[PDB]
mmCIF file of C-alpha atoms in Angstrom:
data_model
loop_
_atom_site.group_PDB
_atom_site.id
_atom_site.type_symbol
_atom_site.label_atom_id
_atom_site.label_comp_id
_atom_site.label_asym_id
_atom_site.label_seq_id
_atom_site.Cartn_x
_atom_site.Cartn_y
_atom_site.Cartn_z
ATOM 1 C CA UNK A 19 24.428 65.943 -4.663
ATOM 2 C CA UNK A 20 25.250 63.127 -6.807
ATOM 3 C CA UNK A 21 28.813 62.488 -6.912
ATOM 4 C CA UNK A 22 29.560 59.663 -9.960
ATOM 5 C CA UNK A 23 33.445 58.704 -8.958
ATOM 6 C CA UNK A 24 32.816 59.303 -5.187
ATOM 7 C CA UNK A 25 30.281 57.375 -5.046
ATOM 8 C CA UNK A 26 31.656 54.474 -6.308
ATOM 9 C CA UNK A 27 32.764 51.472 -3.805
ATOM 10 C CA UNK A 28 34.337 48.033 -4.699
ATOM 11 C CA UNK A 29 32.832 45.443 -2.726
ATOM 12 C CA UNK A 30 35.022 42.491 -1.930
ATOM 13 C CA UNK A 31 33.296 38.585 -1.409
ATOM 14 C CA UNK A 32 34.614 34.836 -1.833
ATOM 15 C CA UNK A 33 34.484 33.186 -4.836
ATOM 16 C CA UNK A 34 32.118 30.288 -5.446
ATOM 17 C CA UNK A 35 31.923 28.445 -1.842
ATOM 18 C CA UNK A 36 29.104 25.969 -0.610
ATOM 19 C CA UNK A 37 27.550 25.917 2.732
ATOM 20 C CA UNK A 38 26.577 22.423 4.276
ATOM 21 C CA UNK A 39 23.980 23.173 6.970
ATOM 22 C CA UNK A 40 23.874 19.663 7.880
ATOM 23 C CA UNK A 41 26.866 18.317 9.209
ATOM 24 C CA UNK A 42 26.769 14.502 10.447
ATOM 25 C CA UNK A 43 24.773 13.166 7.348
ATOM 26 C CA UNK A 44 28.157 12.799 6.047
ATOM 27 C CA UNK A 45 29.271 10.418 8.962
ATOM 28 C CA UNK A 46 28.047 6.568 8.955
ATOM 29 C CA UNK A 47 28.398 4.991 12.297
ATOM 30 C CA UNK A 48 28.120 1.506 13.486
ATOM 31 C CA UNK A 49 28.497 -0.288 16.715
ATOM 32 C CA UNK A 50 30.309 -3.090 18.384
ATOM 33 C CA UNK A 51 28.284 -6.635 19.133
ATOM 34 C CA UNK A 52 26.035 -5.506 22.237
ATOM 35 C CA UNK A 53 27.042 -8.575 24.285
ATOM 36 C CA UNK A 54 30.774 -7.353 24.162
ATOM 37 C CA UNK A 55 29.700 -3.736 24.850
ATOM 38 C CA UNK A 56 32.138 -2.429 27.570
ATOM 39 C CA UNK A 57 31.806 0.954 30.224
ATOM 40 C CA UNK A 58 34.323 3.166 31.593
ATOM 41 C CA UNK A 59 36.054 0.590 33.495
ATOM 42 C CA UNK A 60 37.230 -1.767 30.230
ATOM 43 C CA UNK A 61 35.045 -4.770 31.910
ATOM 44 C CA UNK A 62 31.982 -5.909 30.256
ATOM 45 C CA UNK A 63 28.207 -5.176 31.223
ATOM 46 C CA UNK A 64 25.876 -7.659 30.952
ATOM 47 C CA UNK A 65 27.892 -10.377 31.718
ATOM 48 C CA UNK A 66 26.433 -12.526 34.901
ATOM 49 C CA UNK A 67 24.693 -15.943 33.149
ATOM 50 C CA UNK B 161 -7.986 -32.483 -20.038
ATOM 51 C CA UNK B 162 -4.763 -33.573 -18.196
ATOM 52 C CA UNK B 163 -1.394 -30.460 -17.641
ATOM 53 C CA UNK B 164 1.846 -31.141 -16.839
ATOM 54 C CA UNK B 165 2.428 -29.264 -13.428
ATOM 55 C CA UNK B 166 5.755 -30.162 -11.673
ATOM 56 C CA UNK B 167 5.538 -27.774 -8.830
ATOM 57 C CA UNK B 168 3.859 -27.380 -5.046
ATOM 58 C CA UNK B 169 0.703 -26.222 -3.962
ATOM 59 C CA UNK B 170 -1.323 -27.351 -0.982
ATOM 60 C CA UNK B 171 -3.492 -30.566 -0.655
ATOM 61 C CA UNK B 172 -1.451 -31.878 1.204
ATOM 62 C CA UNK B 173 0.032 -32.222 4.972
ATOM 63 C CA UNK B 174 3.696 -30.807 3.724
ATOM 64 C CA UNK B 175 2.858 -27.397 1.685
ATOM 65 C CA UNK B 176 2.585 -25.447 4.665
ATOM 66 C CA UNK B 177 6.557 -25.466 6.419
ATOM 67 C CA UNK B 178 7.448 -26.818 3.365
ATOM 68 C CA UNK B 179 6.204 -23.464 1.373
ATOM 69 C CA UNK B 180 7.592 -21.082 4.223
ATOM 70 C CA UNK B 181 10.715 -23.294 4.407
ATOM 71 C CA UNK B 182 11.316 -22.424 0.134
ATOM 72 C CA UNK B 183 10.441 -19.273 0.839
ATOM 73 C CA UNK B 184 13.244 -18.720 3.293
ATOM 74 C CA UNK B 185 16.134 -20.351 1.542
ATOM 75 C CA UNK B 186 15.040 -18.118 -1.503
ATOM 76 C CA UNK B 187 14.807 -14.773 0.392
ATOM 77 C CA UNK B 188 18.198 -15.805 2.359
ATOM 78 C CA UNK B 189 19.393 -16.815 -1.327
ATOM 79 C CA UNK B 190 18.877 -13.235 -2.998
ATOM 80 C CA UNK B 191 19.564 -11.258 0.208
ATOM 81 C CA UNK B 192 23.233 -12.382 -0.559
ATOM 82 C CA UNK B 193 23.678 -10.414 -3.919
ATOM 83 C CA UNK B 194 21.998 -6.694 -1.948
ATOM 84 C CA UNK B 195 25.423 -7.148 -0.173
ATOM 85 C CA UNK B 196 27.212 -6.869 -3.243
ATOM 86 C CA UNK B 197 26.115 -3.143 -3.240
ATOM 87 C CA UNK B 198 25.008 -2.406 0.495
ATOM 88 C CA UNK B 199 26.613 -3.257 4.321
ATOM 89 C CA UNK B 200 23.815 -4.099 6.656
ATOM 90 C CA UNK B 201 23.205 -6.515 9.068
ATOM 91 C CA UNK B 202 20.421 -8.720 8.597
ATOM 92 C CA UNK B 203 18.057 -8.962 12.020
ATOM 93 C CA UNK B 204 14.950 -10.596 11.037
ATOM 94 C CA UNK B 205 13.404 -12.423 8.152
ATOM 95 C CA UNK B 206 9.475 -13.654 9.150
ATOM 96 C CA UNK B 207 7.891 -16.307 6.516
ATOM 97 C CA UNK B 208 4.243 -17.664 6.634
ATOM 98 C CA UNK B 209 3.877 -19.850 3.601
ATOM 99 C CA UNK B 210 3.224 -17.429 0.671
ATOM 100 C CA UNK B 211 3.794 -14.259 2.290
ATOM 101 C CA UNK B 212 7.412 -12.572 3.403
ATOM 102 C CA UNK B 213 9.313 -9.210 5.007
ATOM 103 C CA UNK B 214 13.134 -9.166 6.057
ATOM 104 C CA UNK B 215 14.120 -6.151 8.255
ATOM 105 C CA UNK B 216 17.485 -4.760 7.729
ATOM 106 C CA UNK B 217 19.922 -2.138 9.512
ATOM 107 C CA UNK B 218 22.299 -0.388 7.630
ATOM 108 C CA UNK B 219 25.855 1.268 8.461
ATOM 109 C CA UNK B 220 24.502 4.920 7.839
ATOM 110 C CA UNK B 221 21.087 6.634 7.536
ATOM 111 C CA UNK B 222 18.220 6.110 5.288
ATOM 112 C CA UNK B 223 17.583 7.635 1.887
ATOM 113 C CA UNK B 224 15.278 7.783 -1.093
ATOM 114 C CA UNK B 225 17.551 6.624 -3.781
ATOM 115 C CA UNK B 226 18.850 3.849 -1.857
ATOM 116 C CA UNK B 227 15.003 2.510 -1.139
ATOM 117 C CA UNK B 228 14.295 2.941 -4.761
ATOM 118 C CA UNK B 229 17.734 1.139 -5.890
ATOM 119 C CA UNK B 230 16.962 -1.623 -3.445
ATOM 120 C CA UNK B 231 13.616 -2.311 -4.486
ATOM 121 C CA UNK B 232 15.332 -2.266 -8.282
#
């Protein structure tokens, strides 16, 4: 049987949010000159002439 | 008939480099005002007399508008 009042609910949510799905488009990203490009060690690679 | 023309064409032993070599101080010319309103490093321009592409690399990713506003 159809109870009006007890059948009532409130139903809770945020208010007004936005959802990125993407998440490095937002990063720009450059890199160092590739004859002083370095390893682990802090010595250069590609160094012997 | 007889027209004033004070400009290059070819005919003659120079208009080859000497077309290619216009071409490349004008594209190197302009490609300093893009910077004005874009970071990239330029890595190649290629001339052959009356022809010309310049290859560019950019700080970020690629987009649509960016193409478009280039090209403007």
């Amino acid at each position: 049987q159809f109870d009006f009042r007890a059948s009532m609910h409130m139903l809770t949510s945020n208010l007004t949010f936005t959802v990125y799905s993407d998440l490095l488009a937002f990063v720009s990203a450059d890199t160092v000159e590739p004859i002083n490009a370095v390893a682990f060690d802090n010595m250069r690679i590609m160094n012997e002439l | 008939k007889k027209i004033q023309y004070g400009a290059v064409a070819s005919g003659e032993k120079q208009t080859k480099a000497a077309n290619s070599i216009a071409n490349l101080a004008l594209i190197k010319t302009v490609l300093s005002r893009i910077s004005n309103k874009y970071s990239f490093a330029t890595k190649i321009i290629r001339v052959d007399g009356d022809d010309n592409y310049a290859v560019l690399q950019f700080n970020t990713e690629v987009t649509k508008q960016m193409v478009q506003d280039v090209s403007n």
